[PDB]
Design a protein around this ligand. Structure first.
Ligand SMILES: Cc1nc(-c2ccc(OCCCCCN3CCN(c4ccnc(N)c4)C3=O)cc2)no1
Ligand SMILES: Cc1nc(-c2ccc(OCCCCCN3CCN(c4ccnc(N)c4)C3=O)cc2)no1
Lengths: 297, 245, 242, 58, 242, 99, 58, 49, 49
């Protein structure tokens, strides 16, 4: 029995998020209203205090004389679907005849969008993201030529046997998905759900995954959360013998049904590595351009 | 009304005369977890006084050639009080924070700081300078403690991102003509309802002077900077033996 | 079967095609979503957020890069003299690249609306002064004196308790929208100029410093819009990210 | 459509209209979002708001 | 005819595509279905079924493989000493591969819910003893003594008529789901440890044996779930099945 | 000894909280577990060899020749199912030919 | 659909929804099954059940 | 899938075919239209001049 | 195989065949072959005026 008083008046057990703000609609920009001259004391919108860390609130009406303007300019193309749902390159897989990378007619690619910076710098504006996807595969020889060849793809989730060869038993794909496709056909294209254990893909993890005495030889696991490693993507030329033709495979990602959180700044230095925000130190270029004099253009 | 403020949580209390308004990070207050969002079945513990009070970390100095600092939360309190001695026992953790910063000066001094709160502030090394040499940051730069760690390249915040855009986060300034403190309140920012307190480090406080300190001789040169903070709505779960790290 | 007739636009992959594609994992129900603070539904919530402006973009070396953030004001005779200038072109190369506004106008060609530039004074409490901020619309050359920039949109600010002032750059254009500007015939879409001047002087007593610093803060108003998304010029990659 | 609520946005307070053929809703189209904003979450998140005309510090 | 326009994802065979295909035998009506006992509509009906756990997985030779099934308990001084340990990771290599639960989590990546481990004592009726079963959640190292494992979830059991006890491994996780674990960064999804200890001793009179045996029985509870089906690592085939 | 499983639960052994579980059980069904294609056979029609050189081949319909799919069905004893076969033809190099 | 009841599940006590074009229902889609369970068929099949709290052997 | 049967007049580009084509810029709303003097809806307005 | 890419104003014009402007993350693009029919897309009114 809760007979004391400090337990009755307690704030413990509050599953509610006190929100000061509340969203509003805005299918168009704001309509500028009319104003006239004012010569009063006290009222003074220009003088702000920015130490508080809030933005200004002065407007065209309260600083100068305006007219009425009925703005019909939409705000629909600044949304996230209309900003992210545009395909871009995320990977490349080579299957050459004789080389050093992948000569035996198979290749494994670790699913990771962070290898090309047009698409990485768009997502790295946000921290947590929750999105479906739509991959697309474009196969071609180095010359762009199109050849009559059969190909197999296989999504290898975590904990599953990675194939070690072209004639392996992991290619029966009884439970894993797969995509047979030819090059004479159009690009392959499939859809993807949100596959994480968590509730969002975080592009930035500040911590270590495991416990232990973190020595210097195990600092390569800084910034590694396994709730983003969504597995592996395998590919091979179907057959028992080697192929007559080299090949290259390009992978495009298109995001849809997006939700984002946590705005944060944007990269200004060139990328170097993956899963790693490192920058060159002796080559810190400014954020932008420069000139000769503050008093002159 | 907007200048004078007081902050009473726990046994402790803070006053201030030349302050500004209070900020709520990302527009909402802390909270305890819902029975829908949560996943673990064990009943937490919620002390409500012994942990939710103001702790004072360490007192820096602000010279003219200073560059900046950062602190990682909630790493700062893992060896301090009944808070820390719960966070070692348990495995799961949830909390908010109130954050108060001090720097006083007379009416002849001048300067400005920027007091920002950035979630998931990964640190990045310089790649040997040439760019090719892959490196990684050591343990004393990612969890430096309560004694803080000093920046080397503050224009990029040591992560390839400018400081010019750090105001989009919950920020405040300390312009010594106007104010002398900055109060910031923050909820629990993570994709998961509970998460560890020792491995993971949810956000980092930054303090970077933009306009440098300056004065004239005969005036007091020592201009400290003190950092005060309080947990709020703290929960714990997964009891077992104490783990330092 | 049912007669069909394949038209052109067939066996093509348009990247921006909002169409249906096949799934791989049937009856897959993902993880539920808890409340995460900071959900942003549109980018205009960010373009209405002040970020520091680099008016002092003269230095280049890696030690003096923080000097870009603020420009000084010192004590002068009192003739009404020039301190700083900069353009009102966000998408153009200049001070505006430091912003989150000038980087989100790289992913969008055209823009509109009114802009706002807030200044702040990091000087001593016992200091005084007044300044004449101006906005010189297109067409007109850079003002040579303080009695010429005055004829345009201008603001006057007294140093005091309220340590800031807001200049507002309204929307003055023949066009509803403006594609970004550069040297050439695309200076048809130039915004103008800002041109700061001294109205009285920078006065200060004995014991205090003779030089101070001003910080600026660029942002937008509620009538800003953007459209016709594209890819930016700054591709932050030399070779292969390994 | 007698399909499943597998999409990522299941649980959001906005309305979409989409086109689909397979039983799995993460294969649907992006569609149109609901047009909303909340700049006071990032620009004026203060506890005690202030008036435009009247000066903040008093 | 009716205009069409073939989009990508054309002339592809996705194995997991629930679509329509043509038949070969029209007007074929198959044989009716009688009642057969044992219809199973879902796999969770099986994951809630106890199967023996191989805690004693030290032997390898084909004669002593039945020794894996049970571990002994003998008479000791009474200092509170260690008997056995094992992890609570079903999908990981270990004792849990003997189960029908640990083999149905090979065909599914992620898991959830609470687990249960039941023990049983095949000793003599005239014997007595007590034991301290414990569950040490993640993060914490393996306990060195009995006064350290005690600080976690633990159960105490007296030997008697009821020849069994149930330890319950509740769901303690930051995540709603857990992909399977192994040495590396995927120890972020480790479940914990079980660590059995002596509370008093193994007491027995004259005439009876000095050593006994304990059998274990692993299973799940009603909040277990699995998703994201895949193919297992164990492919039981060398060459061609002829 | 009775040969029935336990019935103890989290509530009756320790102290729990309320948790509103929304985790589906739809992907553990049999259609969502079996309706995933896999290899069941191979038929060779080579030019000159010893198996089937004369341009024809007979294959005895039997799924029990590859163990990814055999070990899924051998969990059960009696099964009643429709099916959907699919045929992929190719030379040994993977090349595609007009035949 | 004016098709035939040739499918294998004709006679089961669950409901499906499917998509078909040919007149033979074994060419239809798999679809969605009805979500049900019966663990007491394999875990507690005893004749005289017992209570959780009260011990079995008495 | 749904049986189809491609008839002739297939994979042809007739210039005067009033048909549907795919877009490139989704959610693109263009500039509004002010009143411009001299709107001509048909050429017969000119042949009578 | 062929690639097309609409380069709006203010965007980086490619200077080579192996350039980085071809990732087309935000710009549109059209992959197409010659064995296929003609490519064909729609266009809005894109002016500021
Ligand atoms: C048949 C067949 N199926 C498929 C098929 C192949 C792959 C699929 O997964 C696509 C998931 C996309 C994952 C996208 N994320 C989320 C976080 N993250 C990273 C990565 C590296 N570092 C960080 N910090 C974050 C990342 O990269 C689905 C389907 N194709 O063939
Ligand atoms: C045109 C044309 N039609 C076809 C076409 C070809 C074959 C068809 O039958 C497919 C039936 C699948 C039979 C599957 N089972 C059931 C039991 N069983 C075995 C086998 C060996 N040992 C045991 N203990 C059990 C087995 O293997 C239908 C159609 N393709 O081309």
């Amino acid at each position: 029995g809760d007979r004391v008083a400090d337990v009755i008046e307690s704030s413990i057990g509050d599953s509610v998020s006190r929100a000061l703000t509340h969203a509003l609609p805005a299918p168009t920009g704001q309509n500028t209203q009319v104003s006239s001259h004012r010569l009063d004391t006290g009222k003074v919108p220009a003088l702000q205090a920015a130490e508080i860390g809030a933005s200004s609130n002065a407007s065209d009406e309260s600083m100068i004389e305006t007219r009425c303007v009925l703005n019909s300019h939409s705000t629909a193309e600044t949304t996230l679907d209309s900003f992210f749902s545009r395909a871009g390159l995320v990977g490349e897989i080579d299957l050459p005849l004789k080389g050093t990378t992948n000569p035996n007619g198979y290749a494994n690619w670790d699913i990771d969008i962070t290898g090309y910076a047009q698409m990485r710098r768009k997502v790295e504006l946000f921290t947590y993201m929750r999105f479906d996807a739509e991959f697309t595969f474009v196969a071609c020889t180095p010359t762009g030529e199109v050849v009559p060849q059969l190909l197999q793809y296989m999504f290898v989730p975590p904990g599953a046997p990675k194939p070690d060869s072209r004639e392996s038993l992991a290619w029966q794909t009884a439970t894993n998905p797969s995509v047979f496709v030819k090059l004479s056909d159009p690009p392959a294209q499939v859809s993807v759900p949100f596959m994480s254990p968590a509730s969002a893909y975080q592009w930035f993890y500040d911590g270590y995954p495991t416990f232990g005495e973190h020595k210097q030889e195990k600092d390569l696991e800084y910034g590694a959360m396994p709730n983003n490693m969504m597995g592996t993507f395998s590919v091979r030329t179907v057959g028992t013998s080697k192929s007559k033709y080299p090949l290259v495979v390009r992978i495009y990602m298109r995001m849809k049904h997006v939700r984002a959180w946590i705005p944060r700044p944007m990269r200004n230095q060139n990328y170097l590595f993956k899963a790693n925000p490192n920058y060159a130190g002796n080559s810190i270029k400014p954020t932008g351009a420069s000139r000769t004099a503050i008093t002159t253009l | 009304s907007d200048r004078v403020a007081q902050l009473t949580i726990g046994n402790s209390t803070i006053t201030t005369q030349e302050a500004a308004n209070i900020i709520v990070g990302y527009g909402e207050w802390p909270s305890y977890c819902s029975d829908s969002d949560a996943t673990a079945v064990d009943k937490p513990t919620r002390p409500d006084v012994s942990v939710n009070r103001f702790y004072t970390l360490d007192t820096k100095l602000w010279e003219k050639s200073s560059k900046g600092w950062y602190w990682k939360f909630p790493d700062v309190l893992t060896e301090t009080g009944v808070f820390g001695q719960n966070a070692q026992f348990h495995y799961l953790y949830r909390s908010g924070f109130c954050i108060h910063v001090q720097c006083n000066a007379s009416k002849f001094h001048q300067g400005a700081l920027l007091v920002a709160v950035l979630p998931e502030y990964v640190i990045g090394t310089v790649a040997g300078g040439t760019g090719t040499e892959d490196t990684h940051p050591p343990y004393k730069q990612t969890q430096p403690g309560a004694d803080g760690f000093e920046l080397q390249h503050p224009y990029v915040l040591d992560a390839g991102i400018p400081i010019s855009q750090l105001t989009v986060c919950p920020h405040q300034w300390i312009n010594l003509r106007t104010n002398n403190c900055a109060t910031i309140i923050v909820p629990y920012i993570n994709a998961l309802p509970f998460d560890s307190a020792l491995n993971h480090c949810n956000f980092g406080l930054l303090v970077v002077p933009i306009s440098p300190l300056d004065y004239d001789q005969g005036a007091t040169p020592v201009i400290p900077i003190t950092i005060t903070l309080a947990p709020m709505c703290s929960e714990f779960a997964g009891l077992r033996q104490a783990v330092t790290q | 079967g049912f007669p069909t007739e394949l038209k052109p636009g067939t066996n093509q992959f348009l990247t921006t095609d909002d169409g249906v594609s096949a799934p791989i994992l049937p009856n897959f129900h993902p993880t539920p979503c808890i409340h995460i603070p900071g959900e942003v539904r549109n980018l205009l919530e960010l373009c209405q957020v002040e970020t520091i402006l680099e008016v002092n973009n003269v230095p280049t070396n890696a030690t003096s890069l923080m000097e870009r953030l603020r420009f000084p004001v010192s004590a002068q005779a009192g003739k009404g003299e020039l301190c700083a200038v900069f353009r009102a072109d966000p998408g153009r190369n200049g001070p505006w690249q430091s912003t989150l506004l000038g980087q989100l106008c790289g992913y969008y060609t055209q823009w509109s609306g009114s802009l706002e530039v807030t200044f702040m004074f990091t000087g001593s409490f016992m200091a005084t002064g007044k300044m004449l901020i101006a906005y010189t619309p297109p067409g007109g050359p850079l003002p040579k004196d303080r009695a010429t920039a005055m004829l345009g949109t201008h603001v006057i600010w007294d140093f005091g308790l309220q340590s800031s002032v807001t200049l507002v750059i309204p929307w003055i254009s023949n066009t509803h929208y403006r594609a970004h500007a550069r040297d050439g015939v695309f200076d048809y879409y130039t915004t103008g100029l800002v041109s700061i001047w001294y109205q009285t002087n920078y006065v200060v007593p004995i014991g205090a410093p003779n030089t101070a610093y001003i910080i600026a803060l660029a942002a937008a108003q509620k009538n800003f819009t953007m459209k016709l998304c594209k890819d930016a010029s700054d591709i932050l990659q030399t070779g292969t990210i390994q | 459509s007698h399909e499943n609520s597998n999409s990522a946005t299941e649980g959001s307070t906005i309305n979409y209209t989409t086109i689909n053929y397979y039983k799995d809703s993460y294969a649907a189209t992006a569609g149109k979002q609901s047009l909303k904003q909340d700049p006071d979450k990032f620009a004026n998140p203060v506890k005690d708001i202030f008036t435009e005309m009247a000066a903040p510090l008093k």
